Design a protein around this ligand. Structure first.
Ligand SMILES: CC[C@@H]1C(=O)N(C)c2cnc(Nc3ccc(C(=O)NC4CCN(C)CC4)cc3OC)nc2N1C1CCCC1
Length: 273
């Protein structure tokens, strides 16, 4: 199946099905210029009828376009034909962290700070570009062949003024800031090390009081530096939370081995030491 760009020329070849978004259908797409495979969202016009989703797809593109960073999924090109919206994105062959953590359950400390270093790197560029992610989760940390991490899915992204990790300040109807991303970051780290989030992720009104409030159990299994860092990122009030610069300079990062580079065997098997 060859896909021609009606505006510009211009030929692409679609390969294997990668999965679903949602709500989009995803495929491999080789730019024939060029000769290179991309992970691509193929969004038919048939699901984007309401003048409500059309704006949300347009926004994601608008925001993702101008992002250029080694730990941010690279936007390549978008176009559309008769059928379908085409968003061509950086191919990450090892899928995501949600995948690897399903196989592993829990990660070792050197692995955790290997992934977090890359996340904070990507999120920092994001936050300097005045853009907020608003949907940080393991499923949105894409991993390439070289075991490198890219932050992806700017579907919920917006610039400064339903997600996995609701912050207390968002639940106090004060909207989403940069510190609300740092909230998600602590949840991410907690899950990497323990394999269950610190709070319920149902987004139901019953877990709201639980996340005001920031009441959660800190397991004994966690080492002190890991414990002290998580507690900081998950502080009740947003102002008490550490800066992104503060996070990567914490004792958790300065003490301990740490790669790069990780072997991909770490996707399924637990690494030596
Ligand atoms: C474009 C959306 C998002 C994204 O933004 N980027 C950048 C991305 C970059 N790279 C990938 N890579 C792969 C993702 C999944 C698979 C895979 O194993 N899929 C299987 C196919 C056979 N099957 C029936 C079971 C599922 C392989 C990948 O590369 C080898 N996926 C990406 N996605 C995903 C696309 C579907 C949701 C998320």
């Amino acid at each position: 199946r060859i896909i021609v760009d009606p505006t510009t020329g211009k030929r692409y070849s679609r390969g294997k099905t990668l999965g679903k978004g949602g709500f989009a259908k995803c495929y491999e797409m080789t730019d024939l210029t060029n000769n290179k495979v991309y992970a691509a969202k193929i969004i038919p016009h048939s699901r984007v009828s309401k003048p409500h989703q059309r704006e949300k797809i347009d926004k994601e593109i608008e925001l993702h376009r101008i992002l250029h960073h080694k730990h941010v999924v690279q936007f390549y090109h978008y176009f559309e034909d008769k059928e379908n919206i085409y968003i061509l994105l950086e191919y990450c062959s090892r899928r995501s962290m949600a995948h690897i953590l399903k196989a592993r359950k829990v990660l070792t400390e050197p692995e955790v700070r290997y992934y977090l270093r890359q996340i904070v790197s990507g999120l920092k560029y994001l936050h300097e570009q005045e853009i907020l992610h608003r949907d940080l989760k393991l499923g949105n940390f894409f991993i390439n062949e070289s075991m490198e991490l890219k932050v992806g899915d700017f579907g919920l992204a917006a610039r400064l003024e339903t997600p996995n990790y609701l912050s207390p300040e968002v639940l106090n109807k004060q909207g989403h800031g940069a510190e609300s991303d740092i909230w998600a970051l602590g949840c991410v780290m907690y899950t990497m090390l323990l394999g269950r989030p610190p709070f319920e992720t149902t987004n139901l009104k019953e877990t709201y009081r639980s996340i005001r409030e920031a009441r959660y159990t800190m397991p004994s299994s966690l080492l002190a530096p890991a414990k002290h860092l998580i507690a900081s990122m998950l502080s009740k009030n947003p102002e008490d939370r550490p800066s992104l610069d503060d996070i990567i300079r914490h004792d958790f990062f300065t003490q301990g081995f740490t790669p790069d580079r990780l072997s991909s065997s770490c996707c399924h098997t637990v690494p030596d030491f």
